[PDB]
C-alpha cells in the first residue's frame, strides 16, 4: 500500500519561471519491475490542472531512461551527473531540458499553445517518486514497486525563480515516499541542496 508517492521539497508561490538542479544517478536494485524517478517541475501540487516536469528513471535491473512531460527516451549511467530544468514562459508555454553533464549529451523540448491543461506557476518542486503505471485503456493504474537506491539522490545547485527573482528553499514543504506505513525516503533541505536517501 503506497500512502505517499512523492518525496522531496515543494515550494508554493506565484509566477514561477525556472526550476533547475543537478542530480546524481544512483544504483538501483529490487528486480526489473522495481523503479524510482527523480525530477524537477512546476505545479502538480496545489495546482492540479497541469504539471511541467522532466527527469530520469532507474530500474532494479540496472537500466535507466529519461523523459519530459506536460515522452521518454540521452544515455544514462550510474554515477552520471544530470542537470534538469523546466521554464514556464506563460501558463501555456515553456520548456524542459535534460543534460547528462558527464556524457555531454543534451535534450530539450519547447512547448506552446498547450490547451489540454494550463500551468498556474504556483508550485515548484524537486522530487523522488514511486510513479504509476497504467494500461488497459486508462482504467487500471498501479504504483511500480519502489526500488532501493544508493547513494542518496541529491539535487544540488537547486534554483527557483519567480518574477525574475530567486527564491530560496528555506520555506519549502517536505514530503517523503511512504509505503506500508513506513518512510522509504529521507529527503531533507539545506542551502541549495535537496538530499534524498532511500530507507
Coordinates of C-alpha atoms in Angstrom, one line a residue:
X1 CA 0.0 0.0 0.0
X2 CA 1.6 3.2 -1.2
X3 CA 0.4 6.1 1.1
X4 CA 2.6 8.8 -0.3
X5 CA 4.3 8.6 -3.6
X6 CA 6.3 11.9 -3.6
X7 CA 9.4 12.6 -1.6
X8 CA 11.3 15.9 -1.7
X9 CA 10.8 19.6 -1.5
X10 CA 7.8 21.6 -2.7
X11 CA 7.8 25.4 -2.9
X12 CA 4.5 27.3 -3.1
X13 CA 4.2 30.7 -4.5
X14 CA 3.4 32.6 -7.8
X15 CA 4.8 33.5 -11.2
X16 CA 7.4 30.7 -11.0
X17 CA 9.7 30.9 -14.1
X18 CA 12.6 28.4 -14.0
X19 CA 13.2 25.4 -11.8
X20 CA 16.5 23.6 -12.1
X21 CA 19.1 21.4 -10.3
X22 CA 21.7 18.8 -10.9
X23 CA 21.1 15.3 -9.7
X24 CA 23.4 12.2 -9.5
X25 CA 22.2 9.0 -11.0
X26 CA 22.1 6.2 -8.3
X27 CA 22.5 2.5 -8.4
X28 CA 19.2 0.6 -8.1
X29 CA 18.1 -2.8 -7.0
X30 CA 15.0 -4.9 -6.3
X31 CA 14.4 -6.5 -9.6
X32 CA 13.5 -5.4 -13.1
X33 CA 10.0 -4.4 -12.0
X34 CA 11.2 -2.1 -9.2
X35 CA 11.8 1.5 -10.1
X36 CA 12.0 5.1 -8.9
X37 CA 12.4 8.5 -10.5
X38 CA 14.0 11.9 -9.8
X39 CA 12.6 15.1 -11.4
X40 CA 12.2 18.8 -11.2
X41 CA 9.0 20.6 -12.1
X42 CA 6.3 23.3 -11.8
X43 CA 2.8 22.8 -10.5
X44 CA 1.1 19.5 -9.8
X45 CA 0.6 20.1 -6.1
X46 CA -2.0 22.8 -5.2
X47 CA -2.2 23.4 -9.0
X48 CA -3.8 20.3 -10.4
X49 CA -4.6 21.5 -13.9
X50 CA -1.1 20.7 -15.3
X51 CA 2.5 19.8 -14.4
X52 CA 5.6 20.8 -16.4
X53 CA 8.3 18.3 -15.4
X54 CA 11.5 16.5 -16.6
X55 CA 13.7 13.8 -15.0
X56 CA 15.0 10.3 -15.2
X57 CA 14.1 6.8 -14.0
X58 CA 16.1 3.9 -12.6
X59 CA 15.0 0.3 -12.5
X60 CA 16.1 -2.5 -10.2
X61 CA 17.7 -4.3 -13.2
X62 CA 20.4 -1.7 -13.7
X63 CA 18.6 0.2 -16.5
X64 CA 17.7 3.8 -16.8
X65 CA 15.8 6.2 -19.1
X66 CA 15.0 9.9 -19.3
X67 CA 11.8 11.8 -20.0
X68 CA 9.9 15.1 -20.0
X69 CA 6.2 15.9 -19.7
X70 CA 3.5 18.5 -19.8
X71 CA 7.7 11.4 -23.9
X72 CA 10.7 9.3 -22.7
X73 CA 13.9 8.1 -24.4
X74 CA 20.5 10.8 -23.9
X75 CA 22.0 7.7 -22.3
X76 CA 22.2 7.4 -18.5
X77 CA 24.6 5.6 -16.3
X78 CA 25.1 5.1 -12.6
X79 CA 27.1 8.0 -11.2
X80 CA 26.3 10.4 -14.0
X81 CA 25.5 14.0 -13.1
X82 CA 22.2 15.1 -14.7
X83 CA 21.2 18.8 -14.9
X84 CA 17.4 19.1 -15.1
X85 CA 15.4 22.2 -15.9
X86 CA 11.9 23.5 -16.8
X87 CA 10.8 27.0 -17.7
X88 CA 7.3 28.4 -17.9
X89 CA 7.3 31.5 -20.1
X90 CA 3.5 31.6 -19.7
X91 CA 0.6 29.5 -18.3
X92 CA 0.6 27.6 -21.6
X93 CA 4.2 27.6 -22.9
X94 CA 7.6 26.7 -21.6
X95 CA 10.4 24.2 -22.0
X96 CA 12.2 21.2 -20.4
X97 CA 15.9 20.4 -20.6
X98 CA 18.0 17.4 -19.6
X99 CA 21.8 17.4 -19.8
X100 CA 23.9 14.4 -18.8
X101 CA 26.9 16.7 -18.0
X102 CA 29.0 13.5 -17.7
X103 CA 28.5 12.3 -21.3
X104 CA 27.9 15.8 -22.7
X105 CA 24.6 14.9 -24.1
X106 CA 21.6 17.2 -24.0
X107 CA 17.9 17.1 -25.0
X108 CA 15.4 19.9 -25.0
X109 CA 11.7 20.3 -25.7
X110 CA 9.8 23.5 -26.3
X111 CA 6.1 23.7 -25.5
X112 CA 3.4 26.2 -26.7
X113 CA -0.3 26.6 -27.1
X114 CA -0.8 23.8 -24.5
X115 CA -4.6 23.7 -24.3
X116 CA -5.1 20.2 -22.7
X117 CA -4.0 21.8 -19.5
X118 CA -2.6 25.1 -18.3
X119 CA 0.0 25.8 -15.6
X120 CA -0.7 28.0 -12.6
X121 CA 3.0 28.7 -11.9
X122 CA 2.3 28.3 -8.2
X123 CA 4.3 25.1 -7.3
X124 CA 8.0 24.5 -7.8
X125 CA 9.5 21.1 -6.8
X126 CA 12.4 18.7 -6.6
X127 CA 11.0 15.2 -6.2
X128 CA 11.9 11.5 -5.9
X129 CA 8.8 9.5 -6.8
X130 CA 7.2 6.0 -6.8
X131 CA 5.5 6.6 -10.1
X132 CA 2.3 4.9 -11.5
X133 CA 2.0 2.6 -14.5
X134 CA -1.4 2.4 -16.2
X135 CA -2.8 0.4 -19.1
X136 CA -6.0 -1.4 -20.2
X137 CA -7.2 1.7 -21.9
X138 CA -6.8 4.0 -18.9
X139 CA -8.6 2.1 -16.1
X140 CA -6.0 0.1 -14.2
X141 CA -3.2 2.1 -12.7
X142 CA -0.7 0.9 -10.2
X143 CA 2.4 2.2 -8.4
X144 CA 5.5 0.5 -9.5
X145 CA 7.3 -1.4 -6.8
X146 CA 9.8 1.1 -5.3
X147 CA 13.4 0.3 -6.0
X148 CA 16.1 0.6 -3.3
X149 CA 18.8 3.0 -4.4
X150 CA 22.2 4.3 -3.4
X151 CA 23.9 6.6 -2.8
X152 CA 21.3 9.2 -1.9
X153 CA 20.0 11.2 -4.9
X154 CA 21.0 14.8 -4.3
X155 CA 19.5 17.8 -6.2
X156 CA 22.4 20.3 -6.0
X157 CA 22.6 23.9 -7.1
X158 CA 18.8 23.9 -6.9
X159 CA 17.4 27.1 -8.4
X160 CA 13.8 28.5 -8.4
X161 CA 12.7 31.8 -10.0
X162 CA 9.5 33.8 -9.8
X163 CA 9.0 37.2 -11.5
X164 CA 12.7 37.0 -12.4
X165 CA 13.9 36.9 -8.8
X166 CA 15.5 34.0 -6.9
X167 CA 13.5 32.0 -4.3
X168 CA 15.3 30.0 -1.6
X169 CA 14.2 26.6 -0.5
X170 CA 14.1 27.8 3.2
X171 CA 10.3 27.7 3.3
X172 CA 9.7 24.6 1.2
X173 CA 7.4 21.9 2.4
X174 CA 9.0 18.5 2.8
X175 CA 7.4 15.2 1.8
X176 CA 8.6 11.5 2.0
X177 CA 7.6 8.5 -0.1
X178 CA 5.6 6.3 2.4
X179 CA 4.8 2.6 1.8
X180 CA 3.1 0.2 4.2
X181 CA 3.1 3.0 6.9
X182 CA 6.9 3.4 6.7
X183 CA 9.1 6.2 5.3
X184 CA 11.0 4.8 2.4
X185 CA 12.9 8.0 1.8
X186 CA 14.6 10.6 4.0
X187 CA 14.6 13.8 1.9
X188 CA 15.9 16.9 3.6
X189 CA 16.8 20.5 2.6
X190 CA 19.9 22.7 3.3
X191 CA 21.1 25.7 1.3
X192 CA 20.6 24.9 -2.4
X193 CA 20.6 21.1 -1.9
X194 CA 17.7 18.7 -1.6
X195 CA 19.1 15.3 -0.5
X196 CA 17.0 12.1 -0.6
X197 CA 18.3 8.9 0.9
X198 CA 16.4 5.6 0.3
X199 CA 15.3 4.0 3.6

